[model samples]
Target: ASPFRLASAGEISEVQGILRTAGLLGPEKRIAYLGVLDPARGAGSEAEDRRFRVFIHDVSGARPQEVTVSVTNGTVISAVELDTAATGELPVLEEEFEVVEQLLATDERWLKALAARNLDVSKVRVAPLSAGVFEYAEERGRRILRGLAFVQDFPEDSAWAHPVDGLVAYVDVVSKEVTRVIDTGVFPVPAEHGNYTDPELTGPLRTTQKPISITQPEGPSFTVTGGNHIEWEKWSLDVGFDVREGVVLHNIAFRDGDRLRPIINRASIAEMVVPYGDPSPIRSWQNYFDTGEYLVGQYANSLELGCDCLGDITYLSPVISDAFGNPREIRNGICMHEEDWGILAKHSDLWSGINYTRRNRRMVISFFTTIGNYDYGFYWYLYLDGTIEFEAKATGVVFTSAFPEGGSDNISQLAPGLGAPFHQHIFSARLDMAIDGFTNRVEEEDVVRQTMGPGNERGNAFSRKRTVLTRESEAVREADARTGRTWIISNPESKNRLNEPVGYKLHAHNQPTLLADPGSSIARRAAFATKDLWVTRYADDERYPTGDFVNQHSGGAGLPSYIAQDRDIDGQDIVVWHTFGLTHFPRVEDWPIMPVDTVGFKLRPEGFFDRSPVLDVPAN
Candidate 1:
């Protein structure tokens, strides 16, 4: 039987009368729960089983106090306090039933207010105990509870596992843990198990080698001096030669544009083409992978033939053009493309149809041109040669970086700083070739160059004339040793001002013995030289804002009003280089909205290349 059951009908009536007087029971009162009973258990055991403490607050009242009731016997708890003033402060234990009625009346207002706010009262669960009884219980054997409340199970999880601002402890019924604590930090909410995975969107492309042929009548060519004068042009008809080693020579010359005088007799010309075979096939823009096979296939098939060729060519000239269209003159624009090509074609026939390939078996050809300036472009082409399959690549300009204001003076200076008093700008372009078999791989890759120039001139400033700057070559031996994907080339040695001449070159070939020598390591060092030169000591100057140093050399004048002039004006040539190939690495966050990847080389104005190669060219 329940411990709090009425012993007689008279007692029950008396209890009902008391509750009515206290305003707790009325004609409209609703019974929420009936007495719980354990008929087989004794009164003591039932008391322990049914014992439940509840702390209630008048949700509708301005001030609410704890009202405790014992489920074991349905009895109220009280407390008392005594002071020296002959007065006593105590819980209303012996007060009349009317006094209790007033308390219940006040609590009704608070409860009604809480109900108006739509708060579910049934969801609220708290241990029941009078304030004074709770204190006494704590002094005896019960634990001192600070802030405690019972909350319904979360939709996803039952036990709470969130960080708390203050001390909090809870029992995890599922874990059977007596106590669980939450620290002040982010924690995961309990939920059903789930796995994380990334989907594979595309497959990799196979590495195949095929013969590459390039023909450009309007491309740039150069003349070489020293050991043997080799005149090279880009427009000659198909001339074939064995790329199996040995030197192939081409001699050509041109007349000075202003004086109409020939400069070939006074200068020597030579062209060196270094090809890199078995290039780690690159399919994606930022991510490059080595396919273990050469770019060109080894066996000849009726559908396809293979050839892998990569790298740059360099031509040396003792007689350079001057600014006033004079031969061998070093003014502003003497060595115009017209004269340069004329000299190259006039001096050599071998360059008209020279065939070359690297140790890795990549094939390439060079042609001579007199009509077009030194402009170079790269692209891939496909065709069928009789029954054999053939595909070739035409090297061309991929993209160029822009020059900032303050011209060449801002090349290495930070923007608004002492030496770097110019603003910086950037320009980008896409390559013409498309990877056929790749997906997200190529999406992030871009052959781009971040050019620093004046804020005004961005895309409209460039020269059509083609000229060879400086070139550096590094040969790799074991193909497996160079399996790392992607190669980078940068101009780290030029020092010319914006108004001066600046140039650089990069060539990669397969030389099995090159890496065996200690001196060969210097090649990498040479590539990094320019990067070291750009490091400045006055980086912490207060005259410039933070990050302004990046614009010093490449950006233009750092004036606030300079941003208005971004278009090209007549007679102004914007000199820049198109840096190609895999330029940057991709990050994991680039999965959905991939950022544009850029990498490549730069041309700083240093005295390394010609000071004024195009001075003789017409300004207009």
Candidate 2:
């Protein structure tokens, strides 16, 4: 059996039964997550391969626990409780999102805060936010979520446009109560409707643009086998879906002649943190862990034709377990298709009177998830040239607030009274690379210009300066745009045609790291975002960048803790983590709904390919 296969619908139910029989689950306890346990190596026996990991949360006790269940033996393997102070809290539940709104409706102080603003409670929408780490005695170590109110003119109106500023409500999930309400009573509600979906709000739709059609008459040039395995051109991979990390690609490889060359073993967007820049009282605790806190896969959008995707499309619907441990299918959860990229290579020679060109095409596997005011699309591209790319597209409405008096640099005024705060969206990608094989080493390559001397009198000579990163601590590095720096992962034993180690080079976006102060709560909690690249020894349980839990986390967990051992990484199984993203300052054009802001990195074949891999591309 394939070790990376997703858990089946029957298997999901079987695990639930195995847990319930062991007296681990009941009405007071609920399943927060369930995933296939990726074995360190191929199972020693058939029974050992049938293991799964289940995360359960105690609803009444405010506790989180983990259990490993083996279906072949029909028994539970092990169970352990997680300390909230160490692991933080579990991801927010779907029911808690709705329960907080109801809790606020009955609280008198919360009602008075709305009434003082002359707003109707029935027409208002509230966003339940993760209460980040602070010194507040009431919120410390509690199962809590904070609420921010927004006004809606109609039931279908955009709720994010009109924020009821300077008021916050704290609710305890276990107690089913709104514990406190904080009201500073500053700034009035914005007057804009902010409903771009309604044509009446924008007056008239643009008639200048014509339709652009994409058609693949014979259908896409790819085959999806065994439900999750995909083969396109020379590339082959298997896809996996999780509640936290939406789309995961496993066993990514390329075919060379009759041999399959392994590239990456596993790849996924492990974690992401969005921290706001505003220093005001109401907006300071605004750092959000979108993937860890909100669970992107559970909130994934159902795709549609002629809207979410174009061209010939193949879809995969993954079944996710609900809070009650029932399977719920997300239709079209993964979209796979092919795209033509103009030209792969082209040349026209006048001396030889000959012209040569080859068109490029890439297979795209993508998914989208909406978390509050933001919608994120994650895409994985496999090209004919043996290059792989990962892209993240951030769109939808920017979180809005009322424009401050005299205006502030931290906020951008979108309209007469509406403003959007500046923030940074930092994403960490976990690349479990198997370049040629698992015994890989990392090297930092930078270009250096030679000084005018005996070697270079004209000062035109430049060469690549390669520095081997032999240990974990030495590999904690940043991207240098000045020298065109890139990190390479190469198998020491696998040599290419040039007798060099077969390798892939990481091309980063060279964006800014975290902007918070060194000792700040966000900076400590999101320590993974402070560096552009980190290399660590591979571990099965060390998947997420910010550890397993992130809700209301104090500090110092994920990557920082993972690399504490400082293990030697050269010529051993190593995992590469790269941080890349956008630091967005809100603008007038970004209001109502922002355009898709895309950022990502590329893994190009450095010495892995002997020559142009697409020389056999047929001319049309």
Candidate 3:
């Protein structure tokens, strides 16, 4: 049986027709149909039982609605609009199809903005947003999709090294108009340093290419089927695409006692925002939610083998729709392969002189989305030890906001008139954990220091404090290094031989929360980044951390609003949202092309298994 019952190619038309017949679809319809995705989460979910969650826009240009339509094996269960607004969850607006085209389309308004900034508009190419830019102009305005520039009319692959300075353009997607333009100041576009290219082996860049080869005598251990289906060892999942979030894996289950057990039903990037701490008109308002503004799947790169992934890498294609509702396939949207993880663990006995060490092998699924000058590489890794790792790699040139010769007061300068501001890259992941069964409990375990009492003779003492979240109201939690605060999500009814409930522990890599002022605009809009952990009871309607229609969304729409329900989350199907990222301050050495900077976290089995699952690893 298939893990998920997705809408067929014809079903898209059928669903649209159903909405259209009910006067739910049309250019004039205020309830504009944006997109539909996976439906309700409960125990014993079947193919026929699966429904579709549809996101819609109100005629008054307000927050969108979540409509859940019943389906009997891909048949629309309802004739008219399904129950108007969903209390279960907030669905994200999947308009990546329309926004992708609009952002990439030429805008003379953008040219004017460049011209005002003293930039040669013809020489500067508007670096397409993964979706569209997120703006906050109307105070409580709609997401004003904006696009920025990169000096890309280059002879080599160095366009990314040169970011056009102090210019941004806003576009009205529906009206097909470039409404406003902002030229922060007169700053020169980064000149073509001609360093990354091989101009006939000239210009400080004369390097020979090296050959790379991978041999698999017995064929690859991992395989990609039907393009998006992946299976390796005990890991199996269907990789799908969403315009904004790019490559999202559905029903990410692992082989357990029955060779099929659910872990996280759905896993994807919930919301991401990059905050540049520069307060200039050109740079200050550069808080971007790439996924919501422009879909990441649309900007997915066709990965290169041997370079992107070693061994026999398999490419997965995603079918993406256009503005006119045309379904075109995005080829090579994601890559899958088995990688040799270095030195998993080692053991040696001094007396017996017995040494044992095993090779670590892992299956990985990866895809990349180019957001202007920066490229984001996302990967879902499955290990033999029942561990799931979310790894994000950020590359590309630093964005240099225009400033005086000295650059910022402190940060190092990359080149002439370029000083990269300190910024934060924060990503919150939505985890729908199904540990053997659907009902699960989430609790925090903090290893705190014990008070210095008589019980503590030497005075060095520590104790654990585990707090079980009984309900879903804004439960703000921080990652503590001293106490080592961690989240343990487990099934109460399910237990290992040791009598401990089977669970998954979140090893967040101890990354700190966002540093933006607690009351700043970015701090308010992307509230999920404030705390590393948030637990909400399962709601079929709330799909995203940020509510649907989040272009210039000023706070209260995303995670903050969802938890307002404060429903009882304890021992119920729960969604655990975890955030992790880095604070990047650019240096001169990272000028041309920044090396890959990876940030991530993991979920590992904690007393979930009877014994070591990786013991079966073959010794080399």
Candidate 4:
């Protein structure tokens, strides 16, 4: 007899009998067997394979099990169980035996209750839970887990949940497909739905403040002398205001485990602007490079300034508490939960209606409102040197994310739909400014002049004409859609004409047009003559339309569908200006207590910088 054939038919039968006696196998169950060893291949060699495969079916439960057995010397070596029913008893293995026993008991109790209600016990099929594995780093320690899938099933009385006999069912998470059979009663509930309750907060209420300000004469205006303006320069500005001020008031009395907790602490604004012209020609002159010819001949032009604290900022807090008052501080910044960014771009069509030629210097100012909280005011000042400045008022509160008592393995993926991806949550801003006309003048100065005049008088006239040809020029004009204000101005000129009459009908181009006729282009093009006017564009093919207001709690992943057209505040056709790149830092030297930091943007004038510009300005 070969060692490979040690487990003869009789020996296999004996092992089956033992399993039956031990209640591991039922009589109604049929087994399909496969021999792992072949005498012809291995004979009685030491290397003979010892693995055997078996499939078992329980007729009573309508359940199937797949198992692998290792055998040697005509006896069972080890049985590796794969899928099996909860036998109302603990497994002999110690590793996961307790959890298995508990789960089995729960299932058994649920089935018994159904049986007592005259429900068909033959229709019951218990399914194994699907699992997901995730890994993430945290301040406390790195954690990993195999998360189980959660399911939300209809009530038993519903047609979808009708009882049937011997059915099998499973859910495919990847395809989001639900497979069903007549009655193999396997239903796996998702872990999210299993608990169905909010977790408790584990710490005392804490607070932080973020202040913002803006200063740009042609953009927004801010008070420089006040505490709001920490750093102000000719071409740049910094605004500071506390977004957490109001949040602290609302969240002070807030309770842990409350659903509204995340909403209270989200508030802060950051903005920057690049202005045209400064002492340093190349450095300060960079703005002119970005705006191209638009930077020439203009007294001063500044970029738009805008920022907002729109979503949950609760991830900044470091404390956590349990129901029993135990505290744990979380040491990670949560992902952003709000995706809405403010805009301040140029609007030219509305300018012609105000009769304001696109040449006068103008400024715009904008402030965002807290959902229900009172608004905080900020300012911007545009200096003649082309420097922008900022100032802000401290208001609003801060917020943080909530974690369960037992730390979660997948908290990193629990970001809100509206939030931006994880990036440095630094409080900073950037501004870009430009200057034109120097190139043509330098070229003209280098050109050799031919005598074309008879005397100094005629020669002076010729030189004057050439100087006019090389003179630097910057001009800008725009109209306001909301207020129909129009402004036109010329650079190097102190007097700016505002509140101009606009007769031309403002039309947004569906596509960009190239200017072939210089006369027509010059007539149409203002100081900042560029097609990149709108900050955001709308398209029908978008899942969520641009400029649509989203109610984060109710909205899913795309554009919010429930918001009415009239309620779309973002689409109100406002020219948005955005200044990027401003930085703030807290020095260790100021450890125990740090000075208040500020940040913000300004909405300056293009053409129609304000609604009813004439009505708002005092008559000269």
Q: What is the TM-score of each candidate against the true structure?
A: 0.15, 0.97, 0.82, 0.19
lDDT for each candidate structure:
0.20, 0.87, 0.67, 0.24
lDDT per residue (tens digit) for residues 430-456 in model 1: 111101100001000113333457752
lDDT of 2: 0.87
Report the poorest 10 consecutive residues by lDDT, candidate 1: 283-292
lDDT of 4 by residue, 1-620 (tens): 22312224443554455445545466555443222322222233566545544444443444444454444433444454432212111111111112322333234444454454344434333322211111111101111111111111333211111212222222222122232212323322111211112133224444575664433325322122321121112222222211111111011011112221111111122211122111221111111111111111011112122323222221222222111112222232111121212222224466565432221232222232221111233333332212233434323221111222343332211222111111111111111111110011101111233474566545543221111111112111122233322221111211124543211111221122121233321212211222212121112222111111111011121122212221221212111112222121212221112233444433222321223232222221
- Give the CA lDDT, 0 to 100, for residue 97 in model 3: 30
Model 4, clash count? 137
What is the Cα-based lDDT of residue 394 in candidate 1?
Answer: 21
* Cα error, candidate 2, residue 440 (Å): 0.5
lDDT of 2 by residue, 99-141 (tens): 8888888889988888888889897788988888887776666
By lDDT, the candidates rank as 2, 3, 4, 1
Backbone clashes in model 2, listed as residue pairs: none
How far is 247's C-alpha from truth in model 2 (Å)?
Answer: 0.5
